Amino acid sequence: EDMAKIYGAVAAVSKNVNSSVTYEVKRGTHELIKVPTIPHNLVLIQSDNGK
Amino acid sequence: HALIKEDLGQWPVETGISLVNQAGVFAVQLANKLGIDKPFVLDAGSNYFT
């Protein structure tokens, strides 16, 4: 019985080993919007007689 | 066809860690199954017929 306790404690220590890490790489990334129209900013000014 | 199979059970083994440490845990359970953990003396002398 006391041997099972000693053997169990050793197995607990051996099981404390770490395997790996996992993380997401998202820094520096931004979403993109879509502009549907082109701004021209033009107006045609014409006289009444058209000259 | 016939065969003789010895069934000592199934014991899971985990990889990546020391095997000897897992064997020690299973050793006490195996001894419990065979009834040899505690001090014993075998009496099988009367298990016979003529």
DSSP annotation string for A1-51: -HHHHHHHHHHHHHTT----------TT--------S----------TT--
How would you class B48 by CB atoms within 10 Å of its CB: exposed for 0-12, middle for 13-18, buried for 19 or more? exposed
Q: Find the helix or strand (DSSP H, E) in which B29 lies.
A: helix B19-34
Best to test chain A binding among B25, B30, B37, B38 (most A CBs inside 10 Å): B25
- Give CA B38 to chain center in angstroms: 14
Chain B residues whose beta carbon lies within 8 Å of the beta carbon of residue A3: 28
Cβ pair B16:A7 closer than 8 A: no
Chain A residues whose beta carbon lies within 8 Å of the beta carbon of residue B22: 11
